[model samples]
Target: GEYLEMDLPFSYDGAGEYLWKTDDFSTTVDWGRYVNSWNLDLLEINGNDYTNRWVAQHQVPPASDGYWYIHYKGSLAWSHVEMKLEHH
Candidate 1:
């Protein structure tokens, strides 16, 4: 039973603000700097008032190499994901 998988990559240096473009652009939200804030947009999947199952021990300081991976398992497969990046 193969599924869909994707790895979104990110790199940051300053601590201003951030956002994560979800599967649906309309589901986008602010990215959290403090580890505790990691669940910032998790509610979109869980529920309007959903809570995080657990909190990360340490904060993810402005990093330069962060990545996310997603894998979908089910039928009705048109499973895919995307992103945007600026190269300089």
Candidate 2:
């Protein structure tokens, strides 16, 4: 039998502004300027997308790791959330 646990760290406080994870993914949101509707496209624990929902599933560890790309306002010019895929 197997399950998943989030041994991760995430925060946008003055001390830090990113999420570090060993095998999963996590994120935090904050308010911004007008029309700054903060959004997080999370599909499963290690997947990202532009959809309006959080899709969860059992994802077998990947062969090659990747990074998170914060897309907003029709652009990918910000690192709003930092995610580290160490074991996946």
Candidate 3:
């Protein structure tokens, strides 16, 4: 379904990685501006590590109005799959 809406601020921190945050939660997806492509090695949700199941192609400079979507086909017949913004 819909994860993080495009309205959220997804900008390079001007440091080392992309920072995504909301009032209740925040996370940094690792990648640099200079890096054209990256992979989401792990995914942590509500303190649960669902690493082996999820993967994402994080491209630098995400579209200004582009929402962050994640698709995963994990165990249990590919049912387990699914994020965030200030108003998610």
Candidate 4:
């Protein structure tokens, strides 16, 4: 029993995305920064529109190193998850 997990990092095209790139090359998650808070409304699993698992938007960030986790119960499994990551 293991869950699928991905860790995103903050990168910028001056857009500063907390994004992750999966090997599928088409799947992604965009948890980004806003002027006041952060947004994590974009998640895609198999092009199936995971835009909102109805996750939340928080003002108090989840610690700079607390990457988004997807251990959606110890029952979810996948061969892989996300990104190689490059940032400034």
Candidate 5:
């Protein structure tokens, strides 16, 4: 009935960079660096751990309420992610 999507709009610059999502903005889960894909399918997406584990596959819709964040070690620091959350 619901789904999720994202525009990374960038690439991975370092190792172990991953995606993390939170349902209540309190807890976050890992979705490993998808080998630097600018277009990532968040709906029914499979992820890996930062080290060596499995995040498994799951679907998380941001429509209800929560956060879908990016955690990475890239070429820049002390900057912004240009994240916008709303509706369609």
Candidate 6:
């Protein structure tokens, strides 16, 4: 039941950036310079790949209260990272 009712916060002015949620946290990953033409293996959100794919450039939520799911990019370097409200 959309407890938060607001869009989560995301830090990044580039494409290929997305929001990932879970029961504890909601994270946003921005693949700034870690992207190329051949491969876009940055991270995965809820079984979805956001490596080289251009993420929500516009109409994207900046920040809000909510819970989400995602697979953290382990040991991988990131351009920017931020977290929003994680509803239980």
| Tens digit of per-residue lDDT, candidate 1, span 1-88 | 2223333332222222233322221123323211112223231111122122222212112122332222222122222222323232
- State the lDDT of candidate 6 residue by residue for 1-88, as single tens digits: 1222223443332234343453432134443312111132354544445544444322123234433333333332344443332233
Tens-digit lDDT track of model 5 for 14-40: 333345443332123434322222222
Per-residue lDDT, model 6, residue 78, is 40
Instruction: Flag the better candidate by TM-score, 2 or 3.
Output: 2
lDDT of 4 by residue, 1-88 (tens): 3323442321212122233322222123433321111133334332333332432223222323443323211112221222323223
- List pairs with backbone clashes in candidate 4: none
* RMSD (Å) of each candidate, 1 decimal: 14.1, 13.0, 13.6, 13.5, 12.5, 11.8
lDDT of 3 by residue, 1-88 (tens): 3344233232221112222322221224533211111233433432334444322223222333432332222233232222223221
TM-scores for every predicted model = 0.18, 0.23, 0.21, 0.19, 0.22, 0.30
Candidate 5 ranges with C-alpha deviation above 4 Å: 1-52, 59-64, 74-88
- lDDT winner, 1 or 4: 4
The 10 consecutive residues of candidate 2 with the worst lDDT sum are 29-38
Model 1, position 41, has a per-residue lDDT of 26
Please state the error at residue 12 of candidate 3 in Å.
27
Top of the candidates by TM-score: 6
Q: Candidate 3 vs candidate 5: which has greater lDDT?
A: 5
Scored by lDDT, the top model is 6
Candidate 4 total steric clashes: 0
lDDT (Cα, 0-100) at 24 in candidate 5: 31
Clashes by residue pair, model 1: none
Residue ranges of candidate 4 with Cα displaced over 4 Å = 1-39, 54-88
- TM-score (C-alpha) between model 2 and the true structure: 0.23
Clashing residue pairs in candidate 2, if any? none
